[PDB]
Design a protein around this ligand. Structure first.
Ligand code: NDP
Ligand code: 18H
Length: 192
């Protein structure tokens, strides 16, 4: 795969864009988790799959019985990894571009975490799309949080819902989804 268009997909709590606490997610949003599964899995043409790329810490935070994430090519980045094809579902590498070099029959490429990876790749021109689940809470400062996105969104344009709908195909997009004290919306951003 040469110069793939890449999408960041993330769920973040406004206004600070917190995404984690001591190596874990600060919430469990069932519908959001299903959205993530559906969007990263879905392909528009037959006989392809998508790639999901993540940092070593995020990979390790998926319980071992539940990785690799099914139906997607999983790529894990570590500074200690030489290039290695582990199996048909798992690749080890030290950059996104090198990891995708011998990869074929992949449609979309998603960056799925975590903070360090997101905060590097936001300034990688291969990333053309941000799929940000914008989470709100009445008292956001009360949620324990130590891990944040550093996204210069001034350089980005939040697209209308019609663009997000086109991107996700027939995936149902509900507005102002409420779980416990959290309210959320799915968004799509592109570069200016
Ligand atoms: N809310 C959300 O949507 C999501 C939140 N998260 C959260 O993010 C947090 C995890 O993020 P974080 O701790 O930053 O860890 P990451 O998952 O980003 O992993 C960081 C590791 O990735 C490897 N890495 C980073 N940059 C490079 C590079 N340029 N080349 C090669 N390897 C690299 C390194 O591995 P090594 O040390 O092996 O060299 C590094 O230690 C957790 O709290 C998690 O719950 C995660 C996903 C989604
Ligand atoms: C380590 O963090 C996980 C654990 C699990 C998981 C899977 C099975 C059982 C338990 C946890 C799934 C996904 C993840 C991570 C990779 C995620 C995510 C994610 C989610 C959930 N939403 C959005 N919008 N973007 C994302 N990147």
């Amino acid at each position: 795969m040469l110069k793939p268009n890449v999408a960041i997909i993330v769920a973040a709590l406004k206004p600070a864009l917190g995404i984690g606490y001591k190596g874990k997610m600060p919430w469990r949003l069932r519908k959001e988790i299903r959205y993530f599964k559906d969007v990263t899995t879905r392909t528009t043409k037959p006989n392809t799959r998508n790639a999901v790329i993540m940092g070593r810490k995020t990979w390790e935070s998926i319980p071992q019985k539940f990785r690799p994430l099914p139906d997607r090519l999983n790529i894990i980045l570590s500074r200690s990894y030489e290039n290695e094809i582990i199996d048909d579902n798992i690749i080890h590498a030290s950059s996104i571009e090198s990891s995708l070099n011998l990869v074929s029959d992949v449609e979309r490429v998603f960056i799925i975490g975590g903070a360090e990876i997101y905060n590097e790749l936001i300034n990688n021109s291969l990333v053309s799309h941000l799929l940000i689940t914008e989470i709100e809470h009445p008292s956001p400062e009360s949620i324990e949080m130590d891990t944040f996105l550093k996204f210069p969104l001034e350089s980005w344009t939040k697209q209308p819902k019609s663009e997000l709908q086109k991107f996700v195909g027939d995936t149902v997009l509900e507005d102002d989804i409420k779980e416990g004290d959290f309210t959320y919306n799915y968004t799509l951003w592109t570069r200016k």
